[PDB]
């Protein structure tokens, strides 16, 4: 069998073995900051550096994953606490679009909502041009923030979330337990067929963004994955 | 919502949030043993004392659920190494089956395997009476030790395996993520509608069986859980 | 160790880990209201349905415990607003006294005031026969609802009223802080030995009462609880 | 009656009402990091601007208070994670030690351990000239970091611990709830007669400190403060 696993109690800029783009920062506590607070439509993405392999063209094998992590998110003064954090999975090219509006788009999608890409949304704001539900809310996207399906949620200024995110190849499923900070949980899951969506080698990050008047701190804690491709 | 949370690093005899059926005994570590390896057949279940309200006739509602434990198998001498552990939810009034024959039966149904429950199986041996695949194996039990689903598995003798399982009320799936000793991860996942298998109020626990010639150490080391009912 | 920890920030009729004992009932806001309105040395008791472990013969451990709570108490028209709440501490058979008159026995007491108790009263009524304050007052209540010790207080009608309770085993000693409308806390501590006056297994809960001419709404509206054995 | 109440969510380095002595940094997330990890015996403290009276020579009365706050302690490669952080209260004049060792004085005593405060410590590090015990620790400090008394604890790196502090006026009594990640908590409680070891005005604040060879990540993510003296 093919493994790749990871574990990141604490983030360092200088480790080969992440990749930041953009407005990232890493803090002195070993938290990750995603987007500057004093940027218009800031943006900020973090990578695991190398491409794990998801699916063989030989086999034609697609892999189970296992991933936990840990984020806060943070009111500023007088900002309008947004957009949002996204786990995402994409093309080992990935880059921020080009002219990235930041805001809605979390960072991932062109203006229309559009892009290539497969995650899970941690959405702090309403935006109705994405069909947007009316409050916040976690959403499995495929391609696009206009997600395939959604789930009510709240996000506490302040509070330590957990996430849980199991796939399995069989099934196809891809299924996310939210453990919020007075103990009760959230669920989603969703059929997904990466290997229809995606090529074999991708990379797994997350992604943040705000607008003019849209900022809040976005911070990621920690992070384990384990993925495992049967190779026969 | 309405949510139930605990959480066991280790188990005590006295502790009224734990009921022990049968064989149980907790060993001075805080280490339950499951069966008794001095008996024929024997039998040894642990559950969690309060009913948990899965799901509500009045609103219509299936609650979701986080959970998460590990166990140890372990070979004694001259015995097949036997039977199995599983993770299930049973109705309320749940008791170890009259004339359990153990072996096979996991301790949860009767001679022909059938029974009232829903559990996941790490099943160290073939049984082909209940359509046993040929190896150790992970599976779905939806009132019946013939599983709906199963997926090969090893059992290594003396090594701490981890376990998570996610259930999301909307799509009614459960899946299961088992981390084996040497890091590979295992997945399994079943749609299964609780609301129409088992009742409002129900109990989770372990069981552990063994035969006559097959007996082996069951271990529960570890258990931590969460459930949250939308009552709304 | 061993933990039992709940929280609720809403109660539900129909959830297993709550018992009601008596007038008791639960508002469509989620909060609970313990007497009736419309009767007679009305009483009404809530308590949570598992029985807690504090303290362990075989070791001779005594746990200690964190728990917060919030209520409101209410003045109604033409009744003299009585009698008060009190969080108390019995053992897991506590059955509302038989004959009980309500008033300012508080639904714990008979009519000597003597029952089987540990608890913290939020008195709004002086009996003289119990030897009340002459004023509102706090009290820590041995068995008996003439107070061990009591402090000065001020009910507020339609006021929320927090408090917190911290009891330590090592010196036995149980204090409590209650947080007014106005912002002034109100504190109280007194050495009580739960090993001498209380059994092994334990229920937590609140109670209420009023009488003919006293009556007044008794609303619980949330509750944390948190207790720690060492097991060792 | 006198009270003095304040909440913080977060600090931001220009506001008044902190005062800010030592090594103290804001981070961009709000948080407060106590120490600087590149230097050699560093200690850094945070006081409530304002003065507190907790006790009247005219009338003889001491004030009570409740208090609750979190941390969270971190560990830095290469570094034993030391020396850890204290709540404490002294004089108004209230300055770092002059030739302050950092390392286990934690800030706040001279080299023999001495100084003119009371406090509760986290005790990350057992330094022998100060009798500490064995293992991890909270203990309460009167006037020295040789504490009065200790209770084994538990710290675990970038986990977030809250602590509630309840002081009782008449019976002199402090006692202290930690609430650990897992769950579990801790208490201690000692009387100690604020009123015979500090004078009438009093400022409260955390500090933290390290030494050549231990270093690790002190932080203050919220607290919220509540005193009140009877002025009769
Ligand atoms: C006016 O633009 C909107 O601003 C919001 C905050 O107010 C969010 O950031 C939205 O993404 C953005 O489209
Ligand atoms: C006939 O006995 C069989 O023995 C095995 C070990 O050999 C297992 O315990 C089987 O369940 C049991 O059916
Ligand atoms: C005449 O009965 C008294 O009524 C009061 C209000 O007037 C309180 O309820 C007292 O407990 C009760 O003894
Ligand atoms: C010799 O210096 C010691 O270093 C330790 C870490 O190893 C702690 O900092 C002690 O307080 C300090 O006294
Ligand atoms: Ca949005
Ligand atoms: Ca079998
Ligand atoms: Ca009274
Ligand atoms: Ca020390
Ligand atoms: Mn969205
Ligand atoms: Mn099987
Ligand atoms: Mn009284
Ligand atoms: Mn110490």
């Known amino acids: 069998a093919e493994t790749v696993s990871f574990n990141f109690n604490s983030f360092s800029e200088g480790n080969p073995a992440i990749n930041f783009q953009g407005?990232?920062?890493?803090?002195?506590?070993?938290?990750?900051?995603?987007?500057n607070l004093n940027k218009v439509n800031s943006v900020g993405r973090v990578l695991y550096a190398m491409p794990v392999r998801i699916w063989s063209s030989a086999t034609?094998?697609?892999?189970?994953?296992?991933?936990?992590?840990?984020?806060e998110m943070k009111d500023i003064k007088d900002y309008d606490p947004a957009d949002g954090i996204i786990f995402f999975i994409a093309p080992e090219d990935t880059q921020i679009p080009?002219?990235?509006?930041?805001?809605?788009?979390?960072?991932?999608?062109?203006?229309?909502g559009a892009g290539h890409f497969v995650g899970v949304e941690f959405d702090t704001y309403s935006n109705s041009e994405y069909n947007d539900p009316p409050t916040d809310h976690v959403g499995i996207?495929?391609?696009?923030?206009?997600?395939?399906?959604?789930?009510?949620?709240?996000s506490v200024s302040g509070a330590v979330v957990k996430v849980t995110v199991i796939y399995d190849s069989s099934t196809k499923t891809l299924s996310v337990?939210?453990?919020?900070?007075?103990?009760?949980?959230?669920?989603?899951?969703?059929?997904?067929?990466?290997?229809?969506?995606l090529p074999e080698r991708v990379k797994f990050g997350?992604?943040?963004s705000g607008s003019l008047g849209g900022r809040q701190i976005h911070l990621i804690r920690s992070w384990s994955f384990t993925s495992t491709l049967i190779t026969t």
Not at 23 to 35: E, F, K, R
Not at 60 to 71: I, K
Not at 98 to 112: C, E, P, R, W, Y
Not at 143 to 151: E, F, G, L
């Open 23 to 35: 407005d990232v920062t890493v803090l002195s506590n070993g938290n990750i900051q995603l987007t």
């Open 60 to 71: 034609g094998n697609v892999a189970s994953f296992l991933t936990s992590f840990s984020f």
């Open 98 to 112: 080009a002219g990235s509006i930041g805001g809605g788009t979390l960072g991932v999608s062109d203006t229309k």
């Open 141 to 154: 996207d495929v391609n696009s923030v206009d997600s395939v399906k959604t789930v009510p949620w709240n």
């Open 177 to 197: 337990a939210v453990t919020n900070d007075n103990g009760d949980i959230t669920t989603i899951a969703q059929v997904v067929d990466l290997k229809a969506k």
């Open 206 to 208: 997350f992604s943040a």
